[model samples]
Target: SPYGPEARAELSSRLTTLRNTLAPATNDPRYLQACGGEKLNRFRDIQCRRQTAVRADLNANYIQVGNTRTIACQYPLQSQLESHFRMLAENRTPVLAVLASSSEIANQRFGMPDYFRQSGTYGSITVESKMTQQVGLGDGIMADMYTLTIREAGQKTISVPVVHVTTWVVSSEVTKALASLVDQTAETKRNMYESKGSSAVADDSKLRPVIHCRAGVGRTAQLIGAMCMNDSRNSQLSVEDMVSQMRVQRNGIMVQKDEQLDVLIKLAEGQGRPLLNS
Candidate 1:
């Protein structure tokens, strides 16, 4: 069924309500805390995705399913593999790391050791594989999507399924690149879900996928907002809800203007309601 003009208008109104609720200025303490201390100085760099070589502590809690995990990695300093270990130790949840790299350097940097001794580097391979597969859209935004299917293969126990949507941008080129990548990503996600014989979770569905773009906003917000708009014509989710949900999990989600909003809306309109097999 075509969402029609009435459905579109309803969706728009819902988005407006979400915008009002999820605005960055709304009751957000994490944003304030993150922008409060020395962390504030790093905010600009993180938002620009320029501090790739620098590492900062990720002082936020990650909740998937019923499990709540805390992450405390020093930005991009330690390899993502090392950081995953750190998160596991703090959260005490069994995890399967997914790496996106096919290179030897990535292997050496994040490969698990032979010894079963508990260490912070067990899932380097997985993390690298997932990271490497990510499509880089220039500026500061990069996009990659992941599903829960692989976690079961690795003997890891997860209480719930999750899809990971990530973005990283270091310049204006990165953002523009991300814009292009979004189309490809949407197709990829649709294919993956269809192959699995599952409907793509609606944007307002309870499944809360984790999205990150260095500082967890800006390009990250833009990418996710666009995805939400794409999945359901009747999706009552708004740009504000998208941003607020992101901040609830990742503080400092940066969506600066209506231009970004319009881009997301257009993407959503183009894709229309979710298709079973596209």
Candidate 2:
């Protein structure tokens, strides 16, 4: 129902071209050297919970999703938590999507620490998970939706919807999760404009959602590419075209694996698979 037969076939060919050309996730020694051995970077893998006023140090990129753009990057270090929250508060981003899984969050070694386990202040910003609801993203995937309330020292408090995709897969489910996030962001922005009168800004970039995965390049890139296809305005762009734009915004190795590209094309083609239940 999303893309028809011809468009789907064209996208498939485009992926083949990209697979042949693009290299897998970078083995950038510079990144390795800067982060201090491989193990240290492993201990800190969560991405920024915010999407505004990015720091070049964060390796953050603003990728187009529909008519709006969202921030995609790796998680922050404990020391950088303040800067992360400041970006969220300053940009007024309404949604934060964590593609990282539960074990990843639980194990401090290669995943995220429990930064959102409860409400706590980190540097100048304070955050609390006000509510969490389990939402089915269809395609047999479920995600936990959290209302993250943030209070930055002098800035006005903002409540952001955070969606953590429970199952770690790039399926049509990711599309649905993103759609739900975008819908919530749109509705919140519209209401803010109505209630705040002249003070509210009408900039589309103001409340772009923040998305991240463990490395902030693999699954992150897949979601961005999926949203590009989902947005009607960019529907004319082939899958390769979308990946090209993402590379320019982020880096040459955005999507990483050929298998990831395969799944994204399948998702766009509406090739939903059935779950095997015993």
Candidate 3:
């Protein structure tokens, strides 16, 4: 079973112990409430709920209707690649495909048909700098911090969002980089929102941004949590809540460290307004 009642009871007991161990940190009532109350098993319940919700949401948004909205994952396999491309073509959605190396691109060329290759629908960009690679905890952070810029080639130009992709082996550094990336991405997003003419912008709603790493959990959850906190100042949502929401859409959503949670809290506190006053 995903999470039984007995398991929930045990989780509640464990949370109490965790609260006692981290007294000063858990002192806030909001933290307690997010954890599902003193008598409640918030951790287990939220985890289970999030697992179900994530899958349902993904199916509704991406799978069932076929990639109508922004969808992301580490890599696509031969079995699913054709279908994925077909969905993109049918929906006319712009795809932001990220790959680890040039070889992967070659693989796509060999695996896909000539028609798909000749369609000229896909765009590409390369992040050749190692600025984040040399910093302390930078590799992991670089994994999440993708530099998005406007591209110009000859007479034709296109603006594309560039993202960095990392693997699980470099998770620690990725987490740190993710924190900084979230901060920067929020700033950029806010600027974009403000520059969009004189229309009134809603503060309550969040920008629909997709993030993923290998397995679409660890780094993805970390980035999403940080973005949520940065986007809404009134957001009282905890890392647990963010993880729960993510898991509701994707099973095995990986958010491993409390330190990551701390990073998110700090960034959220540091930023405000999805956009400046319009």
Candidate number achieving the greatest lDDT relative to the actual structure: 2
What lDDT is reached at residue 79 by model 1? 28
Model 2, residue 137: C-alpha shift (Å): 2.0
Query: In candidate 3, which residue ranges exceed 4 Å CA deviation?
Result: 1-158, 166-174, 198-207, 229-236, 252-278
Assess the local accuracy of residue 206 in candidate 2 as a C-alpha lDDT between 0 and 100: 65
lDDT of each: 0.36, 0.61, 0.35
Off by over 4 Å in 1: 1-41, 44-75, 79-81, 85-210, 232-234, 247-249, 268-278
State the TM-score for model 3: 0.41
For candidate 3, write residues 24-103 as lDDT tens digits.
23332222122323222112322222222212112212211011123433333333333333333222222232324334
Q: Can you give the lDDT of residue 202 in candidate 3?
A: 49
Q: Worst lDDT window (10 residues) for model 2?
A: 40-49
- Model 1 agreement with the true structure over 113-150: per-residue lDDT tens digits: 31111122234323222222445444433334332222
Estimated TM-score for each candidate: 0.38, 0.73, 0.41
* Model 1 TM-score (2 dp): 0.38
Off by over 4 Å in 2: 1-53, 177-186, 189-194, 198-200, 270-278
